[PDB]
Amino acid sequence: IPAWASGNLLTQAIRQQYYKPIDVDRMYGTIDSPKLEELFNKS
Amino acid sequence: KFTIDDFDIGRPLGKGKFGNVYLAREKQNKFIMALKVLFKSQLEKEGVEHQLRREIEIQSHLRHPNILRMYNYFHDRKRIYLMLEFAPRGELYKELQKHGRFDEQRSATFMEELADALHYCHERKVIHRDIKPENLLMGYKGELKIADFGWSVHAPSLRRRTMCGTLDYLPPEMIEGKTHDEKVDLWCAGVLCYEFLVGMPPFDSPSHTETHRRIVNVDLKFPPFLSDGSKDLISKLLRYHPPQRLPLKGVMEHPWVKANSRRVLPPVYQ
Numbered sequence A: 001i002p003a004w005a006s007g008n009l010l011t012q013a014i015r016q017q018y019y020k021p022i023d024v025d026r027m028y029g030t031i032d033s034p035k036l037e038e039l040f041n042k043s
Numbered sequence B: 001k002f003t004i005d006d007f008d009i010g011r012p013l014g015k016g017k018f019g020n021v022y023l024a025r026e027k028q029n030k031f032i033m034a035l036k037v038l039f040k041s042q043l044e045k046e047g048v049e050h051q052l053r054r055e056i057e058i059q060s061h062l063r064h065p066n067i068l069r070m071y072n073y074f075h076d077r078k079r080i081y082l083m084l085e086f087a088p089r090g091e092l093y094k095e096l097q098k099h100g101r102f103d104e105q106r107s108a109t110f111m112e113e114l115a116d117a118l119h120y121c122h123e124r125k126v127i128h129r130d131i132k133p134e135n136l137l138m139g140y141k142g143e144l145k146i147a148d149f150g151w152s153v154h155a156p157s158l159r160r161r162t163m164c165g166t167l168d169y170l171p172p173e174m175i176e177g178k179t180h181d182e183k184v185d186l187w188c189a190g191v192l193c194y195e196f197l198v199g200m201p202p203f204d205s206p207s208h209t210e211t212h213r214r215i216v217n218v219d220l221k222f223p224p225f226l227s228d229g230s231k232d233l234i235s236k237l238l239r240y241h242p243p244q245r246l247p248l249k250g251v252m253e254h255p256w257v258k259a260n261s262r263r264v265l266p267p268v269y270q
């Protein structure tokens, strides 16, 4: 388990994310996704 | 465009049939989320490919503070990866088991958040069909998150016929072999409210047929410790006739909900 992922570093990082949310729609929702038809096909 | 190397893997969060969720940090934004990892071969052997596609299609198009968000997804040679919102307080069923039952404030808050999410789903003709504690998670301040859409359906026009959900939560109409609609979720919300407050579901029995019997007779027996407001809300949701059940807007506006909910809306980006 890396440090960021346990005890205090984690809670700290979770709190920051909650009160300072990012534009997840811009950051993630504008990014390409595989077609649902391609999911069980060649990557 | 994403791949597994875009993420630092932190620790396992839950094992499961298909089926492992990890705490993960997306590298370039240092953003903490969860990755659900599925094995392509196992899914196909099990013949659940269309099942999973439909769960992904539904949940990836829903954006609501009380529905667990699917930001994106990707796949490699052997695995499908779902990029999901991390619910830092974990499984609601675990918390219910730990406490036995929830107080009215906690239950009313969860009820408001549930009705708001389900209303968002119904606005879009999505019926969830399997609301129960095990399918709910909790956010940083305890906010309910509808987390699993395993029985869910987008149902624009046609009523439905599929018996689905969980024994203790089944609406009379499913048991009776009638077609159903979105009002199934109203019934399951009443079951949930009861289980929140009592710790057992209302039609608990040794056998499937006795449970079926208690459900179709709406054989509801309230323990004496419940307030009149909580019984009033449960009775208005657990109605034999789907069209007589309290609408979700009705649940949010219910006096017992207004008087007891301490619902907080998560901060939004801007």
Ligand SMILES: CN1C(=O)c2ccccc2N(C)c2nc(Nc3ccc(N4CCC(O)CC4)cc3)ncc21
Pocket (backbone or CB within 6 Å): B013, B014, B021, B034, B035, B036, B084, B085, B086, B087, B088, B089, B090, B091, B134, B135, B137, B147, B148
């Ligand atoms: C994406 N996703 C799911 O798709 C999901 C859907 C349904 C059921 C479970 C799920 N899991 C495992 C998830 N768990 C958590 N959060 C989470 C947070 C904390 C904890 N713990 C609290 C108690 C400690 O003992 C262990 C850690 C567990 C799960 N966030 C997102 C999850």
